[PDB]
From Swiss-Prot:
Highest taxon, organism lineage: Eukaryota
Full-protein positions shown: 9 to 181 of 372
Domain called RRM: residue spans: 6-85, 91-167
Protein name: Heterogeneous nuclear ribonucleoprotein A1
Gene: HNRNPA1
Species whose genome carries this gene: Homo sapiens
Region (Globular A domain): 1-85
Cross-linked residues, Glycyl lysine isopeptide (Lys-Gly) (interchain with G-Cter in SUMO2): K70, K165
Subcellular location: Nucleus; Cytoplasm
Length: 167
């Protein structure tokens, strides 16, 4: 529902791309309430990026699931608009508050519905091997992380975890 969560920044645009062609393209995945190609204020030459705003987050998901997008012959780069202020495009997340009893399958089971998981790193003490209560999950795509980080809550193995982008 909030507009910010229904907006996609689309970089790598062909300078030929217009609001109309960008809209015609992205409308294939949902109702677009907004669609703008960023142009220079004087020359009107495209800035190479724009934004599209869907009527729903599900439509945003559909547009991201439909990548790679080739718009006007160019593979563009869609990213969800910053809930948290730019953009920190990472494929890794830190998951805190899992305690000493949340295992790898707990994390996979939960986080896999967000994207393809490549690495699950449940942190253990270097000396004792005891779980430290936090993990790192690496997906094959930044969008997984973007969907994840925007969530108000995360409950894995009964814990309310704190999930942040990992640098």
């Amino acid at each position: 529902e909030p507009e910010q969560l229904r907006k996609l920044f689309i970089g790598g645009l062909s300078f030929e791309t217009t609001d109309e062609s960008l809209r015609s393209h992205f409308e294939q995945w949902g109702t677009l309430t907004d669609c703008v190609v960023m142009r220079d204020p004087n020359t009107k030459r495209s800035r190479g990026f724009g934004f599209v705003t869907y009527a729903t987050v599900e439509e945003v998901d559909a547009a991201m699931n439909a990548r790679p997008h080739k718009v006007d012959g160019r593979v563009v780069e869609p990213k969800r608009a910053v809930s948290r202020e730019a953009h920190l495009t990472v494929k890794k997340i830190f998951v805190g508050g899992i305690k000493e009893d949340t295992e790898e399958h707990h994390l996979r089971d939960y986080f896999e519905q967000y994207g393809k998981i490549e690495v699950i790193e449940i942190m253990t003490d270097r000396g004792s091997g005891k779980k430290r209560g936090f993990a790192f999950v690496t997906f094959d795509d930044h969008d997984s992380v973007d969907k994840i980080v925007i969530q108000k809550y995360h409950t894995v193995n009964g814990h309310n975890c704190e999930v942040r982008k990992a640098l």
